[PDB]
């Protein structure tokens, strides 16, 4: 029955990290009295922890923003290729945002070029699409949410070559349509472009805030 | 104000993993933007990253087990110093409401018919059991409906005969 106790605390650790927060510590032993033939176990902890503060912000790598708008599908130093069997090109741009404190630069191509036809303001024959899938009940949490589906005058895209093989290095290009056409179709319910319909959503549940729900 | 600093934000659950300790300001704990903080063990673990929307949660169970209902899912703006897309503070949420359909009908019930004749007594000596059954088909139940009560009453009968 010998009562053990703590000895002297050792040297404190220096702050491990060069940015932000870290943790320093001190180590003590139960070496001077020592519990012999039983007793207790020195009463407490052989380890203290402490937070150290370097007060300097940390590297954060930049992240890509979303891609911009596609450029028009025209040719440089020419005119336009609207409503014509001429494949062109168009470009798109990104922006690296958020890079601070010697962080890593954004990895990848900041530009994007793809091949295109042009149906910008092109009068195209059209046909009414079938009923779209029912949308979301809007407004969520607001008074009387309603869904919405719609039929729209879908243009008949012209039967062009979707794959255009260029020479030089024999590069074949997946060509996709660009532009807002002018779809021509017969009226359905007094409307030429889009006729929709709304229906109210049944048995709407109340929105309860998850931090207000846990508490 | 001091705060509990943690070393890792789980993001899959929104929990504060790996406690660095406490008694330290939020600006210093969020210099390392991979860290996270919360006040005590009450909850709401917020990462030290710039504020970004989390993942959309799973859809809530449909408000009724029948016909067209409605179901919710949430998304929480998590981060520190800044705003999410749409003038949203860190901690505010966004909901999506969708019409669900677990099943189609919901049970209307049927009515009983006329009682069947009493069955003979279950034994020929001393005392037994007299059963009386009916059917649930006046009108018949549709989908998941059922008639209220029981379809077979059971009483006792005395045959007045010794074994």
């Amino acid at each position, epitope marked *: 029955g010998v009562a053990g106790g703590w000895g002297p605390w*050792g*040297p404190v*650790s220096p702050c*491990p*990290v060069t940015c932000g*927060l870290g943790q320093t*510590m001190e180590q003590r*032993t139960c070496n001077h009295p020592v519990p012999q033939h039983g007793g207790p176990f020195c009463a407490g902890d052989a380890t203290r922890t402490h937070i150290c503060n370097t007060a300097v912000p940390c590297p954060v790598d930049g992240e890509w923003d979303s891609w911009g708008e596609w450029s028009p599908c025209i040719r440089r130093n020419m005119k336009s290729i609207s409503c014509q069997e001429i494949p062109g090109q168009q470009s798109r741009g990104r922006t690296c945002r958020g890079r601070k404190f010697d962080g890593h630069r954004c990895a990848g191509q900041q530009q994007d070029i793809r091949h295109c036809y042009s149906i910008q303001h092109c009068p195209l024959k059209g046909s009414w699409s079938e009923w779209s899938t029912w949308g979301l009940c809007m407004p969520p949490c607001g008074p009387n949410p309603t869904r919405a589906r719609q039929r729209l005058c879908t243009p008949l895209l012209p039967k062009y070559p979707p794959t255009v093989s260029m020479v030089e290095g024999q590069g074949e290009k997946n060509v996709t349509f660009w532009g807002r056409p002018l779809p021509r179709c017969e009226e359905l319910q007094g409307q030429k472009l889009v006729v929709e319909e709304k229906r109210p959503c049944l048995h709407v549940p109340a929105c309860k805030d998850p931090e207000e729900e846990e508490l | 104000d001091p705060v509990l600093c943690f070393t890792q934000y789980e993001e899959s659950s929104g929990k504060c993993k*790996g406690l*660095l300790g406490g008694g330290v300001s939020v600006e210093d704990c969020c210099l390392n933007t991979a860290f996270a903080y919360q006040k005590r063990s009450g909850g709401l673990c917020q990462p030290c990253r710039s504020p970004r929307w989390s993942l959309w949660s799973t859809w809530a169970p449909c408000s009724v087990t029948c016909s067209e209902g409605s179901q919710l899912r949430y998304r929480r703006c998590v981060g520190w110093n800044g705003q999410c897309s749409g003038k949203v503070a860190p901690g505010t949420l966004e909901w999506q409401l969708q019409a669900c359909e677990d099943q189609q009908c919901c049970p209307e019930m049927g009515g009983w018919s006329g009682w069947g004749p009493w069955e003979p007594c279950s034994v020929t000596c001393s005392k037994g059991t007299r059963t009386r059954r009916r059917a649930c088909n006046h009108p018949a139940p549709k989908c998941g409906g059922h008639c209220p009560g029981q379809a077979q009453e059971s009483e006792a009968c005395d045959t007045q005969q010794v074994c």
Partner: nanobody, 124 residues
Framework: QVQLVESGGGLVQAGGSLRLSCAAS????????MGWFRQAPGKEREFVAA????????DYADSVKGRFTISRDNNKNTISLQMNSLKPEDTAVYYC?????????????????WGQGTQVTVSS
């Protein structure tokens, strides 16, 4: 930054015991979480044991759990690996490793500082 020196290896019979020690740089010792690795002939390097900066939290590989014990002496800038019931499959070059840990109770499996190694050979 930090240098690591292993010691205590040698030739042991099967079932015997061996105690390795790893000396690290004195001024930066309590900053780094530390551990033991080994690389057998013809095999990749594999995790053996880890210890936090505290010496209070340990982690072990399943192949050595119950036989090996990692300890830390924060008075004398050393860690130790007490290897009991040694088998011929434990023959490897044993490496001491050091890794930066933000918390003092965190055990690591990824390390960016490595010693030159100590040879342990177990004969049957």
């Amino acid at each position: 930054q930090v240098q690591l020196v292993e010691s205590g290896g040698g030739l042991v019979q099967a079932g015997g015991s061996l105690r390795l020690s790893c000396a690290a740089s004195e001024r930066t010792f309590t900053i780094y979480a530390m551990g033991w690795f080994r690389q057998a002939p013809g095999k990749e390097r594999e995790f053996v044991a880890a210890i936090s900066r505290s010496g209070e939290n340990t982690d072990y590989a399943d192949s050595v759990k119950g036989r090996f014990t990692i300890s830390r002496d924060n008075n004398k800038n050393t860690i130790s690996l007490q290897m009991n019931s040694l088998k011929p499959e434990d023959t490897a070059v044993y490496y001491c490793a050091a890794g930066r840990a933000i918390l003092v109770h965190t055990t690591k499996k990824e390390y960016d500082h490595w010693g030159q190694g100590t040879q342990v050979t177990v004969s049957s």
